């Protein structure tokens, strides 16, 4: 949702980081892209693919995620 508003300057986030072995400076370096949690910057280009296809909001993604669960379920 943050990415759609400005594709230029927003760093796509892959997912959150929860690695118990992290130290105090390990949180601040990986809490990047303006996030308050540690995360990984995405680099798979999935954002630019999903954008073109027409997804715009966070619930349009969740509606995509649930659909493959069902498609796998059959």
């Amino acid at each position: 949702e943050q990415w759609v508003k400005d594709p230029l300057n927003t760093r796509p986030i892959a997912h959150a980081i929860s690695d118990p072995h992290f130290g105090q400076r390990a949180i601040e370096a990986f809490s990047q892209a303006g996030a308050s949690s540690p995360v990984n910057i995405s680099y798979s280009g999935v954002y630019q693919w999903w954008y073109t296809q027409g997804m715009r909001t966070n619930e349009e993604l969740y509606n995509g995620a649930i659909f493959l669960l069902i498609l796998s379920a059959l």
Binding site: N58, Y62, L69, I70, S72, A73
Partner: peptide, 29 residues
């Protein structure tokens, strides 16, 4: 996202829970 939908999709993934096991132990046989 939500909080109930997070738990909900956890319950959606339970449908591939027992069915992926049932695919396996019969492909074992």
């Amino acid at each position: 996202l939500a909080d109930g939908q997070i738990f909900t999709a956890l319950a959606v993934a339970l449908v591939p829970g027992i069915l992926a096991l049932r695919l396996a132990l019969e492909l074992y046989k």
